[PDB]
């Protein structure tokens, strides 16, 4: 097997899952370890995987990390667009008539600007809040990445009213320590909108940069209620909520 050319040995390593290639293939021998830790392995992994185009044009201080960040990069919020009803959301408050799903654009509502989005969650005449608590390590983001590199964590959500009724939208996104202690908090002022509005969907987004070290969880919560005390679902509607950890770090330890 080590009968093979150095270039060909590299090409085999390309097709090996990275977590395997590092904790198993590297302690096999020096001949292998030297090649696995070669930057051109990871560059070409990114190349083949599509993370990097040959017009790449933007430096990285580390291609192993950069490769993982790109591979892991994905929305950590499950069921963000109400396609599985209410699965994997925790319902912190369920007031009035319950949290409910509804196809777009719904009564006295407008269409969602992304043609991909079909359904939305909607809230009632008393406080309805739902949430998820993203365990960062379980999703593949290992510790020294979170503390020593701190890749920009980006959070988004979308919300619209009905036209015939006023309501209030609330959202909290927090980065919590291993102890579930809050270390960064996106807590925008709650938004109340009145009755006979344009029912327009609105994106809210905030990027966590240079947050403290020790983030182990991203906690994401939103919901609302109407401001007329109406039976049914005249509270705010939300859909398309995302949390994504990008490849940009604030700290390049080398």
């Amino acid at each position: 097997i080590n009968q093979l050319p150095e270039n060909i040995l590299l090409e085999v390593f390309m097709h090996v899952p990275a977590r395997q290639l590092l904790r198993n293939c590297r302690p096999v021998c020096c001949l292998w370890r030297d090649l696995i830790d070669l930057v051109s392995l990871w560059k070409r992994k990114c190349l083949r995987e599509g993370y990097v185009t040959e017009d790449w044009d933007q430096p990285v201080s580390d291609w192993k990390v950069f490769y993982f960040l790109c591979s892991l990069r994905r929305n950590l919020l499950r069921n963000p667009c109400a396609e599985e009803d209410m699965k994997s959301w925790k319902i912190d408050s369920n007031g009035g008539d319950q949290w409910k799903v509804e196809s777009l654009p719904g009564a006295h509502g407008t269409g969602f600007p992304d043609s991909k989005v079909k359904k939305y969650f909607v809230t009632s005449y008393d406080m309805c809040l739902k949430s998820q608590i993203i365990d960062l390590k379980a999703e593949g983001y290992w510790e020294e990445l979170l503390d020593k590199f701190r890749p920009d964590i980006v959070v988004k959500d979308w919300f619209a009213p009905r036209a015939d009724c006023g309501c209030t939208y609330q959202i909290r996104v927090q980065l919590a320590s291993a102890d579930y202690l809050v270390l960064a908090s996106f807590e925008p002022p709650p938004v109340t909108i009145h009755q006979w509005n344009d029912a327009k969907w609105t994106e809210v987004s905030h990027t966590f940069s240079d947050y403290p070290p020790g983030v182990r969880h991203i906690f994401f919560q939103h919901g609302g209620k109407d401001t007329q005390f109406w039976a049914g679902w005249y509270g705010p509607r939300v859909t398309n909520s995302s949390v994504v950890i990008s490849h940009r770090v604030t700290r390049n330890p080398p």
């Binding site: 097997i1 080590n2 009968q3 093979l4 050319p5 270039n7 060909i8 090409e11 085999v12 390593f13 390309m14 097709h15 090996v16 899952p17 977590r19 395997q20 290639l21 590092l22 904790r23 198993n24 293939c25 590297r26 302690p27 096999v28 021998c29 020096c30 001949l31 370890r33 290992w142 510790e143 020294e144 990445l145």
Partner: protein, 137 residues
């Protein structure tokens, strides 16, 4: 509409030229040049090569055909990738290499060293080599 390739040990294989062209290093050989000779390929691997090239004469995962075709013994698999490199059939090289990587999956630093039989190069720096990245995998 064919050409004759001749293996390292003399056997002549006649092939259409469109299939044979997939080997870059003999499309180039053909620009220069009665059977073209390939003394780095013995007759056996020469056939498995043209067997695969005819199967992709006109064209993520691995195809099932390419999987049944590659259910060969391990030394044939290695000759096959060396032939793919020699002949510059960039497709055959990736299928065969990807296959070797799938043998690598699931095995320990020792269990890899067994099923391929390389000798342990380190001393106790394996500790320095597992934990270096095993710290987070």
């Amino acid at each position: 509409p064919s050409i004759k390739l001749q293996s390292s040990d003399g056997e002549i294989f006649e092939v259409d030229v469109e299939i044979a062209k997939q080997s870059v290093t003999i499309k180039t050989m053909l620009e220069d040049l009665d059977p073209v000779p390939l003394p780095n390929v013995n007759a056996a691997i020469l056939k498995k090569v043209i067997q695969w090239c005819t199967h992709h004469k006109d064209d993520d995962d691995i195809p099932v055909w390419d999987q049944e075709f590659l259910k060969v013994d391990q030394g044939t698999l290695f000759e096959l990738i060396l032939a793919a490199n020699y002949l510059d059939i960039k497709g055959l090289l990736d299928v065969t290499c990807k296959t070797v990587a799938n043998m690598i999956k699931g095995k320990t630093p020792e269990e890899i060293r067994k099923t391929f039989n390389i000798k342990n190069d380190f001393t106790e720096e394996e500790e320095a080599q597992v934990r270096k990245e095993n710290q987070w995998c």
